[PDB]
Amino acid sequence: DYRVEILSESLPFIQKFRGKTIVVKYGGAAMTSPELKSSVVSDLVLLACVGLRPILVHGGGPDINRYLKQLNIPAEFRDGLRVTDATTMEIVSMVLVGKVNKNLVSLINAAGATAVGLSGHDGRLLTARPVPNSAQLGFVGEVARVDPSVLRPLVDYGYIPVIASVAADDSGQAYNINADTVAGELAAALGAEKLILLTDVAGILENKEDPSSLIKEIDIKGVKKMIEDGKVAGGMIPKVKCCIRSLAQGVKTASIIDGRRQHSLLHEIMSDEGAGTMITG
């Protein structure tokens, strides 16, 4: 019976964010399982049905890494960013757009909603430029422009967008862009209310060896000191960075949460506690 009286209790939470845009980035690393994966899409679909306007940005570094091993291609990361030569770029685009992006679209469609998967090339949604030390990193990109024109009619027609983090410069050259970075600029480009980063840790950790050292809430000055002090590192760097860049452009909140906790996305939005580290201040 009374499993209804608990649906009732969620009204205030649903009302609070009715109508608002929410950019969710699904970490490649949180994609540990066909079933976890489908719990995340369930959560997205629920948010859409209930009146929020969610947008999925995904990564896929491990899926990429697995194909690089199979094809006998060495891999490198520097401060959370993949060194990317021409050959590797082609593989990146192949896995992110041709495997991950469609795997997710495919799942949403089968959950009774409808998705559209786009890369930055599609409708010129993103324009890339190189990074200063491509010297070292090769074809790694920074986001020069976001043109969200193409998303307007898709959201109007009710489709959920699913975005892959590759794009080209104006001359037509492909670049590999860290998915956190794309998520954050896309959020700013749409004046979104929230940016939410689902990864494979509880949140940001005081100290990365200890999973109970979760920081529940933190401001910008604080988290910048953490990057200096050396406390965030590798792939958590472009995570925190993209939160800061985003907040500074007007996104009201940004959170980092565990993708592999059942229904982490829902806990984060539909409760006061939240489900990881929230940034602002």
Binding site: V143, A144, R145, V146, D147, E185, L186, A187, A188, A189, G191, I220, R245, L247, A248, Q249, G250
Partner: protein
């Protein structure tokens, strides 16, 4: 910046100054509320666009990056106050608009000769003063 000090020494004699602040659009309501809490409640807003290109960096708005010759949206606030209140007001705006990133904004201070309230025909100190405002709040605090 909790302790900025403006230089009004080229305008001795002058009683009024206009504080003109240009900053990020989404800060507008936080700036207006900070001023309201401290008794500044006469102010004028104008949406504008601007350029502030230092070196070869490029500020980031709406996810995209703007350089030389690309106008970028800002909100402007003009606040006319009496000499004594200038440093305080400038500090409140700076502190509440601040983010740390390029394009945060500039504040300019200008001399003003006269103030007139249309409804009453009051002028000068009477016209500039607002009931319930900073000045009155400091007298109740005294």
């Amino acid at each position: 910046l909790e302790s900025i000090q403006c230089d009004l020494s080229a305008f001795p004699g002058v009683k009024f100054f206009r504080i003109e602040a240009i900053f990020r659009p989404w800060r507008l309501p936080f700036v207006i509320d900070t001023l309201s809490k401290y008794g500044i409640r006469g102010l004028t807003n104008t949406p504008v666009k601007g350029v502030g290109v230092q070196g070869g960096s490029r500020e980031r708005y709406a996810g995209t990056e703007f350089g030389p010759s690309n106008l970028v949206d800002k909100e402007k606030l003009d606040i006319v106050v009496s000499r004594a209140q200038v440093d305080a007001v400038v500090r409140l705006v700076a502190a509440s608009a601040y983010t740390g990133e390029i394009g945060d904004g500039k504040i300019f201070v200008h001399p003003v000769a006269e103030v007139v309230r249309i409804r009453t025909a009051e002028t000068g100190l009477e016209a500039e003063k607002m009931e319930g405002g900073m000045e009155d709040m400091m007298k109740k605090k005294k």
